[model samples]
Target: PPRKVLIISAGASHSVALLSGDIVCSWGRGEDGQLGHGDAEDRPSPTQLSALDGHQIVSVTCGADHTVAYSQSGMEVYSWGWGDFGRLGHGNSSDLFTPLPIKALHGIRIKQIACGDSHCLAVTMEGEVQSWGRNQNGQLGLGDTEDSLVPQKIQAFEGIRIKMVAAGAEHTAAVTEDGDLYGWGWGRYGNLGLGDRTDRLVPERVTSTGGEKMSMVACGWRHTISVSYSGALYTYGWSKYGQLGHGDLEDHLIPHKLEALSNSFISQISGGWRHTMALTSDGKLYGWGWNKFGQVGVGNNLDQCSPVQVRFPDDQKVVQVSCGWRHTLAVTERNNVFAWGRGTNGQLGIGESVDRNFPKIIEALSVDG
Candidate 1:
């Protein structure tokens, strides 16, 4: 049997997990072929993508309606799902039902992949960034409004050494090797942290770090968050559902340090469509924002304006956390996977069409050996 999950990435209503054996499993709505099962069908449980057999996958990223996997052997990448707008980088607007190599990106040695609502970004081993897909909102970061059906290098990031990248519904953010941060694309709710609700066709440095060196960045539907090298959490952008964790519903036009979690050192942050989740270096979990389906894991349907600790088995310690559009996924130090929130489209992977108010162990993917 395959080992427990090594990494987990959730899309709007679909999710994909990479197991310890480098095997990949996906579930949830596959109408757009997001599941990579060679067919468009919804799965209520974890299912391996046989197409990836024999390939050692190192990482996986799920967009709003697509999935991308990176194989370590050939330094190659594969993508599938909703291809309208050429989000799959197949050089055409046709949906793919199974994993297929992006002929254009082959041998590029992708170190990381970030996918948004309908766009994708790839960080090469040499610290360069490439983009493809929808460009109407300038999410591609290519300094133009024309869509590239194939991977294209973002000219603005040519000289900069990008260490990592993040993608929102229609925006993009990147962190440099020297800790500089940049954002581009839609900023209607100040998601770009540019101090105004104006769209950017090219990358712009976010200067509101307030002297705190931004280490990592994550983006939601219309919001952005970052963790400083000093372990500080900063949030900005749309807060209509209190996803900013600022104790209010006001949209932040600049990066604001989350005082509520100032004492807790955050190691990771994930932005859901209208919610967020954070993980500490010591295996602790916190969640906030939209809870209409109890995505916050507070055991209720009330929206949260601040960080709230999530409960788990006393013997369990969480090591990784992830969020979907209205749901969340977590991995424990024991290599167990848990899921919660919306399950209408079987995104929860709980074997039943039911909403989980709190983290429920995913027996299908977790093996005790």
Candidate 2:
């Protein structure tokens, strides 16, 4: 029997349709071999990502040019593609033409993983954090600006136990098991949300009013979002696209509470390049920011300066949400998955290049049948 539910997980142009059986049907732009098909091509069929066939993929995440998979056998981590920035954590700069094993992670099991535009981070079984890839803004949290060519231990985070990690365009953030939040890297758009527009070259604690621990955090291009276990949502960073969901477009250099949304408890949140999406416990989905590509699922091209409800005909009640550079996808309570917005690269998974302004069911399963 399958152990979990079906879900859709996305990468830059690659997406995986994960079934309850741990079978992942992958497709989309595989130009960099991110699909692990052993070659490059734009795929329309839900090709099985064989590298993960036998092993159960307990969790998965992706970067701009690579993908990361965590196995259930030993919580082993496997990655593929685009190592130029060392985002794959394979310990080299050689362009990985296929899925490659991360030997450095042989002993320690990975519990969680997060990806940035060109960097990656993982939480060890012991709650220790490790990162690698482009360090232009010190997103790797190694206390230096030099780019790493392999997976390196984040020196400053040696003993601290991290429960979660979030990577954005040029920065990173994490929440500790004890409820504290830490951040580093690019701050040009206040993505660091530390009350100052100064960029950080190392991980540092972020002070906020809601106590010492943040439940979850997400980052877009220049904005940072955090939510407390008590349902308090906070936003900081660039507001050009009004992704802050604060009903205003003013850039925030400090963590500001979204008092309006506090009435409802938000469980999951995702940030696109310039957009944000969230799912509440009630099964409702909300989106904000750049709608130039109709990615907000509002069926209009008008930009939403604040959160707006996305109408989906199916009443499955969205349980999971993922945002790409210009599109959005979600899996519902009934094991149904829907996608919307930019389809220029077929990221919407309807097997077409036409863009969608509303929720569209991905036809992968039909193809599988």
- TM-scores of the candidates are 0.98, 0.94
lDDT by residue for model 1 over 1-369, one digit each (tens)? Answer: 648688999999997999876678999988999999998999999998899977898888999999999886876899999998888998998999999998888888887899999889999988988899999978888788988898899889888899889999989998998998888999899999889999898899999887977889999999999989899999999999999998999998889989999998998899999999999888889999999998998788899999998888774778888889989998888778888999987888978768977888788877432
In model 2, the runs with Cα more than 4 Å from the true position are 1-5, 210-212, 366-369
Query: Model 2 lDDT vs. the true structure?
Result: 0.78
In model 1, which range of ten residues has the least summed lDDT?
360-369
What does candidate 2's lDDT look like per residue over 244-302, in tens digits? 88888999876788776878788988888888887888988889988988889998988
lDDT of 1 at 223: 94
**What lDDT does the true structure give each of the candidates?**
0.89, 0.78
